[PDB]
Scaffold this motif. Structure first.
Motif, short mmCIF file in Angstrom:
data_model
loop_
_atom_site.label_atom_id
_atom_site.label_comp_id
_atom_site.label_asym_id
_atom_site.label_seq_id
_atom_site.Cartn_x
_atom_site.Cartn_y
_atom_site.Cartn_z
N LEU A 1 6.05 1.20 -6.55
CA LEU A 1 6.35 -0.50 -6.53
C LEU A 1 6.32 -1.42 -7.42
CD1 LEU A 1 6.06 -1.88 -3.63
CD2 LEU A 1 3.75 -2.64 -3.95
N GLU A 2 5.49 -1.41 -8.19
CA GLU A 2 5.88 -2.19 -9.26
C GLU A 2 6.94 -2.26 -9.92
OE1 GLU A 2 2.38 -2.47 -12.43
OE2 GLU A 2 0.80 -0.89 -10.55
N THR B 1 16.69 -6.90 -3.85
CA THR B 1 15.78 -7.74 -3.30
C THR B 1 14.83 -7.17 -2.98
OG1 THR B 1 17.49 -8.96 -2.89
CG2 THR B 1 15.40 -10.10 -2.26
N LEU B 2 13.77 -5.96 -3.74
CA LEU B 2 12.52 -5.70 -3.62
C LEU B 2 11.70 -7.14 -2.82
CD1 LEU B 2 9.33 -6.04 -4.80
CD2 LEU B 2 10.22 -3.73 -3.29
N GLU B 3 11.16 -7.08 -1.25
CA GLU B 3 10.68 -7.53 -0.75
C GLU B 3 9.71 -6.35 0.10
OE1 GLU B 3 11.69 -11.62 0.42
OE2 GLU B 3 11.56 -10.56 -1.31
N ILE B 4 8.27 -6.88 -0.94
CA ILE B 4 7.28 -6.37 0.02
C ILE B 4 6.94 -6.50 1.45
CG2 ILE B 4 5.20 -5.12 -1.06
CD1 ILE B 4 7.09 -4.65 -2.82
N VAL B 5 6.65 -5.91 2.60
CA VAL B 5 6.33 -6.01 3.53
C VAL B 5 4.99 -5.28 3.82
CG1 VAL B 5 8.22 -6.59 4.05
CG2 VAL B 5 8.22 -3.73 4.27
N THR B 6 4.85 -5.47 5.09
CA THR B 6 3.85 -4.70 5.64
C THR B 6 4.08 -3.75 6.64
OG1 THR B 6 2.89 -6.87 5.47
CG2 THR B 6 1.34 -5.26 4.08
N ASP B 7 2.88 -3.08 7.51
CA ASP B 7 3.00 -2.40 9.32
C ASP B 7 2.62 -3.65 9.87
OD1 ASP B 7 0.77 -2.20 8.29
OD2 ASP B 7 0.18 -0.56 9.18
N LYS B 8 2.10 -4.74 9.52
CA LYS B 8 1.45 -6.27 10.31
C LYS B 8 2.98 -6.11 12.05
CE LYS B 8 -1.50 -6.93 11.63
NZ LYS B 8 -0.69 -6.62 13.07
N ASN C 1 0.84 -1.39 -0.13
CA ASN C 1 0.32 0.19 0.21
C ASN C 1 0.54 1.02 0.17
OD1 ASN C 1 -2.20 1.57 -0.20
ND2 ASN C 1 -2.53 1.36 2.24
N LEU C 2 2.11 1.29 -1.18
CA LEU C 2 2.65 2.72 -1.40
C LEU C 2 2.08 3.46 -1.41
CD1 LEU C 2 5.57 3.91 -0.31
CD2 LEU C 2 6.54 2.71 -2.49
N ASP C 3 1.48 4.95 -1.27
CA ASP C 3 1.08 6.02 -1.73
C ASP C 3 2.11 6.86 -2.27
OD1 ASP C 3 -1.69 5.38 -0.71
OD2 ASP C 3 -0.93 6.41 1.18
N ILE C 4 3.32 5.97 -3.05
CA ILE C 4 4.33 7.22 -3.75
C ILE C 4 4.28 6.00 -5.02
CG2 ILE C 4 6.27 7.80 -3.83
CD1 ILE C 4 4.83 9.07 -1.61
N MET C 5 4.09 6.84 -6.35
CA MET C 5 4.79 6.70 -6.97
C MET C 5 4.80 7.55 -8.16
SD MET C 5 0.64 4.93 -7.92
CE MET C 5 -0.20 4.13 -7.31
N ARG C 6 5.80 7.18 -9.25
CA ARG C 6 7.02 7.57 -10.49
C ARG C 6 6.35 8.75 -11.68
NH1 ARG C 6 11.65 7.10 -14.65
NH2 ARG C 6 12.78 8.82 -14.26
N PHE D 1 9.06 -0.44 -9.08
CA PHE D 1 11.16 -1.00 -7.79
C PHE D 1 10.87 -3.08 -7.72
CE2 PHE D 1 11.46 2.15 -4.95
CZ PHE D 1 12.88 1.97 -5.12
N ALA D 2 9.57 -3.53 -8.38
CA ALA D 2 9.30 -4.57 -8.23
C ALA D 2 9.84 -5.37 -9.45
CB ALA D 2 7.66 -5.55 -7.95
N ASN D 3 10.07 -4.46 -10.74
CA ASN D 3 10.44 -5.14 -12.16
C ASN D 3 12.18 -4.60 -12.58
OD1 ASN D 3 10.22 -5.80 -14.62
ND2 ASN D 3 8.79 -3.74 -15.59
N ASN D 4 12.83 -3.86 -11.60
CA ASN D 4 14.31 -3.15 -11.86
C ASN D 4 14.38 -3.58 -10.61
OD1 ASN D 4 12.94 -2.02 -14.39
ND2 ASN D 4 12.66 0.01 -13.04
N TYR D 5 14.19 -4.94 -10.09
CA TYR D 5 15.16 -5.22 -8.51
C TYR D 5 16.29 -5.26 -8.89
CZ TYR D 5 13.27 -9.59 -9.36
OH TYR D 5 12.54 -10.86 -10.06
N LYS D 6 16.36 -6.19 -10.02
CA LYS D 6 17.57 -6.96 -10.87
C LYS D 6 18.83 -6.30 -11.52
CE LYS D 6 16.55 -8.69 -14.57
NZ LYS D 6 16.41 -7.75 -16.37
N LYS D 7 17.93 -4.97 -12.06
CA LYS D 7 18.83 -3.74 -12.74
C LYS D 7 19.12 -3.25 -11.60
CE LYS D 7 17.56 -2.09 -16.98
NZ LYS D 7 17.96 -0.68 -16.71
#
Length: 164
Positions: free
Chosen positions: A99-100, A112-119, A49-54, A102-108
């Motif tokens: 978010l997307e 390691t794009l790991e999606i966590v949560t405030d749980k 739930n990232l409220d930030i985008m490019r 970061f998950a599509n360019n984590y290799k470049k």
């Protein structure tokens, strides 16, 4: 059930190590992105739930593009992308989910794009530290920039090299 430990172990390490001032971590899109471009981030920790985008804003006179991180509120104002209080100069043309991205360019970036949560407890720390984006560095780095910033490549004209 890695998700449970993913947040507790990966995230906790982010703050626990910083507790040593080892300088091997970052918080926030701008920061997390900077070190990720630097490939100095071993593991990237971002939230679903990232409220930030490019976004890509234009200039009043054109011939100049600006890239800034906006929230739903700011992004909602795509046409103006300005403020009725200051009258800035922003013109949104395109918008890509960070978010997307970061998950599509984590290799470049080698991160390691790991999606966590405030749980979890650690997941609650990132939210406090910044709120959505944080990065773990591979090793102690001095970063690049001015004298205090670190290196001396802050003014890299190499950006125009790409266009050519």
């Amino acid at each position: 059930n890695v998700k449970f430990i993913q947040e507790k172990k990966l995230i906790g390490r982010y703050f626990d190590e910083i507790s040593q001032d080892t300088g091997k971590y970052c918080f926030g899109v701008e920061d997390t992105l900077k070190a990720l471009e630097m490939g100095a981030v071993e593991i990237l920790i971002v939230y679903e739930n990232l409220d930030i985008m490019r976004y890509v804003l234009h200039c009043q006179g054109t011939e100049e593009e600006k890239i800034l991180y906006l929230t739903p509120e700011q992004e909602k104002d795509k046409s103006h992308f300005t403020d009725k209080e200051t009258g800035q100069e922003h013109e949104l043309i395109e918008s890509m989910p960070l978010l997307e991205w970061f998950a599509n360019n984590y290799k470049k970036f080698g991160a390691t794009l790991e999606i966590v949560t405030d749980k979890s407890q650690e997941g609650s720390q990132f939210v406090k530290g910044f709120g959505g984006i944080g990065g773990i560095l591979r090793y102690r780095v001095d970063f690049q920039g001015m004298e205090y910033q670190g290196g001396d490549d802050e003014f890299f004209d190499l950006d125009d090299y790409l266009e050519h």
